[PDB]
Design a protein around this ligand. Sequence first.
Ligand SMILES: *c1nc(S(=O)(=O)c2ccccc2Cl)c(N2CCN(C)C(=O)[C@H]2C)s1
Ligand SMILES: *c1nc(S(=O)(=O)c2ccccc2Cl)c(N2CCN(C)C(=O)[C@H]2C)s1
Lengths: 161, 174
Amino acid sequence: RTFSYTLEDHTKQAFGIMNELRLSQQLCDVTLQVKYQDAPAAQFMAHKVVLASSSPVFKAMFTNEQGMEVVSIEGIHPKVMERLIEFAYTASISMGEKCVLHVMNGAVMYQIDSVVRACSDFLVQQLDPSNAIGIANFAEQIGCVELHQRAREYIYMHFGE
Amino acid sequence: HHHHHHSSGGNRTFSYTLEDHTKQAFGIMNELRLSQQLCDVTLQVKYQDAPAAQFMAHKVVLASSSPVFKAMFTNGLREQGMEVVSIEGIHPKVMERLIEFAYTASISMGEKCVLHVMNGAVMYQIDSVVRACSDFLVQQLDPSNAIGIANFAEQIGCVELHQRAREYIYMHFG
Ligand SMILES: *c1nc(S(=O)(=O)c2ccccc2Cl)c(N2CCN(C)C(=O)[C@H]2C)s1
Ligand SMILES: *c1nc(S(=O)(=O)c2ccccc2Cl)c(N2CCN(C)C(=O)[C@H]2C)s1
């Protein structure tokens, strides 16, 4: 008859090693160059296949061919991209409250929907009269319909509307 | 160096983990393997009286599941195209099962295949498969097979299987 084995946390151990390889700059076939405003240029080595596995945008980019590619990024802060890359390689992201808007914007641009959803839910929790308008505005700018609606609903509710 | 161009328009802590992210990601990495997309390695596998086989894969995924593949591919030249690696002394179906494990975390095979796979797993230091195979054979330990299994363990280099088998024999005599 049949011998069948599953290692539950194999994908975690494997991502651990893929992250080690990233930081050692081993087997990296993509370089992300990030330029923001009047800030120093930042460079991030990574593996196309790991990026494609976490982002439909990277998947579309790289499946549409063998050799180092450079992706030049403008108007995104290096620490935003570093946080998204670390998410792709670890499944985790941790940051100050003031970072959430810039990261959610990053996440949207590379369709890391789970991070968009995490950021969105967080801001809906933090809604108050001071921030409601800014958040609503931001939501409209970056195109997050659900965050915009929750924020607009929270504002017009203060006027029995 | 094919270039891409992307342009853009209190004190509480935010932290998020997507529990099954590595599973979803491996799902897509496996999809990409079977569609032969983003693959940078082709394994050519040749063994005894069996037909030549090709397996396309991603060096980084193989290296993440096998220290031998990791050593192989970090010792190879950088900015290489597709690389073709000749492999000998492992049967294509053994390597196919190990690759599928690397990409899915699961392995299934006939009971009679366990020895050839465990041998494969040891050769490429896929230790969790070695451990799985070993524990299975330890379940089969009896007076008839204890010696054969102990011998096998020594042949293929599996320390844990050899010790568990020798420990089972020493229980009768010491
Ligand atoms: C959390 N992240 C940052 S950041 O990554 O340093 C950053 C800098 C500039 C633009 C966007 C981001 Cl996410 C934070 N900040 C760093 C300090 N600072 C001057 C900020 O304005 C603030 C956003 S919060
Ligand atoms: C389970 N798998 C196989 S196999 O994949 O067909 C194979 C062929 C040749 C060498 C190694 C393997 Cl794993 C089995 N076999 C090994 C025993 N045997 C006598 C076979 O011919 C073959 C079916 S068992």
